[PDB]
Amino acid sequence: QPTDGRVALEATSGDKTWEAGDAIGIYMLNGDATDGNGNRKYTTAQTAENGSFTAAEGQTIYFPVDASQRDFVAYYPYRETLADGNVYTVDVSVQTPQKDIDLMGAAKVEGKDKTDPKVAFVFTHKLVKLDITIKADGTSLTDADLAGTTVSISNQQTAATYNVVTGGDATVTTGTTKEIVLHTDGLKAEGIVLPAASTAGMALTFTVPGLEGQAFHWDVNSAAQSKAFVAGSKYLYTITISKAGVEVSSKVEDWT
Ligand SMILES: [Cl-]
């Protein structure tokens, strides 16, 4: 904090939630108008859920000296240049690293002034997380037989937009449907995909090298918990693979 009376924003996200260097863009608003430069770069060095953010040099947001109130919004991951009108363009074609496509928005924090400059940003994911666990039936196949299994999801939209000042939901901008290869780490696969009103036509493909590269297909819409992909949710699938085919158990959770 300065020693010549100016009151800087004290930003927090209030064990392994963030990673050192993670950056957010903050806006201080007077109604709909951006007060000063928007998209101010703030970073964290803390990993904890209650981690504090620090302004990049020359990016510090100061409260109005007249003690009038302002509102605050933020988004992750920070982009130096947004599309015209404070718009974040989503592209989920490239899955790795997951953190670089994990778009999050902080709920608007209203009516703050220099007498209480602490703003606790609560971020929510704007996209959808897929968390897949693969296991063998233990009869026709063993977990060892599934070593190297790859996972992909079909007929995906890959482009969306999000206004970082407006908040609310991301909007899918329809284009040509694509197969998205999910990131695998042993018998675990993960992905970040766009929200979808219907999962019809979407299938998970499991290519098992052990079974001479044989591919198993499973319809996402056949699961009880995923007739749609809801923004800010995590879909957990447990895939049991047998020579006769695959079986899946599903769970949906708020993504946290
Ligand atoms: Cl990753």
Side-chain angles (χ1 to χ4, degrees), residues 95-99 183 190:
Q95 290 286 304
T96 304
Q98 295 272 273
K99 71 170 188 77
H183 162 237
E190 68 186 340

Side-chain angles (χ1 to χ4, degrees), residues 97-119:
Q98 295 272 273
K99 71 170 188 77
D100 287 357
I101 60 166
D102 188 3
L103 171 66
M104 305 190 295
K108 184 175 285 181
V109 178
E110 288 195 315
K112 295 280 172 174
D113 60 54
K114 68 187 257 173
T115 72
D116 175 44
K118 303 175 258 156
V119 174

